[PDB]
Amino acid sequence: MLIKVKTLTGKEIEIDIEPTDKVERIKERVEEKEGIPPQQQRLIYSGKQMNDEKTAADYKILGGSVLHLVLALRGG
Amino acid sequence: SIDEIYKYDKKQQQEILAAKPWTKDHHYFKYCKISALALLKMVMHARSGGNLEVMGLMLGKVDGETMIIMDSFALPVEGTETRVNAQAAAYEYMAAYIENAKQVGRLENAIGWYHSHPGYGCWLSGIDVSTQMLNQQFQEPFVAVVIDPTRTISAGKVNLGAFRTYPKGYKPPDEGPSEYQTIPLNKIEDFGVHCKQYYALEVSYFKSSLDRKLLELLWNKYWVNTLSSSSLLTNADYTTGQVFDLSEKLEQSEAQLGRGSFMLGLETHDRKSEDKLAKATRDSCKTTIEAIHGLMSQVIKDKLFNQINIS
């Protein structure tokens, strides 16, 4: 599947994914394209912040699916 | 009873937590009983914010359709009418408190959160409903509570509603009305959409020997200042604001009824702009009731004091 992801430059990038793949890998694909370290990235899939060690099939992401990238969030 | 209520049962919560009835219905609850402690602590903490919002936590349990609020404690957290799930910052302080609490002998689990809306009424906002809706999944049981600490001094009646909201894409029933304490000019809209999403629960109490009485006796002297609320000037800004907005709604009503909702073999279903006059009449009542309530604070003085003259 090829998922689209909305970046912080105001554009959208399609990237290669397998459903079994852990979601921290997608962060690295996004680094490769957008030059943003996977260390500071947070993936939001439809309103919620995506996990790290959890997989993409755990989020039921399909090839039409769209991801939102935002920087780290802390409550205080 | 009077003493059966005071003891907490760990097992009754373990059964309830397994059973998980709330997944079926979120309008399930209907009564509240809140401790004398819970209430006084909640008002004082709310009042310490000033006219600035504060959040605290409540410890309790549930038994059937009753919620029981045993104790409450304050949190030093900022994000009531901005940050969605402000409570997170508070978590470390809560984990401390529950641990400290268990060892002295208070074992009761967290029942919910309390916050306050000062000088605009007892209702949940956009921030508040959004934070509650996460809590009803994750935190359970979790209930929202609102109190106003300025409005209350004038009326003499505690406005405290404990509520719970419905999850997304859930059709509300016909459960509309509640207590009328005016909102400012831009906050009017926000109430209008959100109200049917939640319900308030009715409250009971109990009492014994250190906090209540300094207040009860003090009121015996104190009573003069509550009758010199004199609202009409203090919150003058409210009338002009609501009345200019109520005019915008009547323009909406003239068009809505005038042209009609475009429909082809379809008839309106529940909406927060469905039958505009029927909505609108109630908005006139929340503004009128407050205004005459202002007149009644004036009327009392005029008859009680001024008619005595010098005989």
Added chain:
Amino acid sequence: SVMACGVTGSVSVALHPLVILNISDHWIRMRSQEGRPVQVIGALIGKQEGRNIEVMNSFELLSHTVEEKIIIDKEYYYTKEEQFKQVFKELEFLGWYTTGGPPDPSDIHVHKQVCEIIESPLFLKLNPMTKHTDLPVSVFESVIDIINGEATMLFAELTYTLATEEAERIGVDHVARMTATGSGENSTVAEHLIAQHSAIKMLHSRVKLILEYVKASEAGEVPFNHEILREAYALCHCLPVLSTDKFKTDFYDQCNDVGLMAYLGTITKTCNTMNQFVNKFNVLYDRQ
């Protein structure tokens, strides 16, 4: 008891009821679970403004019994002292409370340990075994008094008062009444007016004590006086509270606004039933 039984000290303390309901509730819980009634010892917080003390709030502390003595755990207290001070720093530490009947040595042992936190802590003692109708909390301070030439820590008792907090009082009303809604929802007029009602009823009771005093000083049973009569005389004379030409129009101006406001609302309500009547009629008697 064990008490000096001296002249009343240099501070006053003020006493008032919900917190002991918090203590009682715990006592009931603990008693059901363990199988024996268990006391709790705790801190007081409140304020002091001058030499007079308003005990505003309290919290329960942890304790243990080794021998016949009670030891309160310090580490516990210091952890709870840092969390509570963040939210309430206006309030400060007054002292402690305990549970039991008359004063005993095991209270004086624990009061010396509290002297380490603040050098002058208050002691408070509640009997829930009271056969008496008056308020069964009694307040003490500790005095260091010499008996047979040896200095002994002995308690001295304080009298009390009632004080502020309207914000808190309105909740004590609700707490006190424990009334249920009738056929409706309870009316807007009803809910609004209760304070106003009770306020009149306070003035009824205030007039009554002054009036019977003035008569008593004339009649006999209280002697004649100048200081109190000159003041009561003066109290009558002030009425009515304004009559000036300046007040009258501004008083009516606000009354007149709230007279239009009310008129424009009763029409809006009527418009609604008119729109509803006209809708239902056209469908039935005509074809719309």
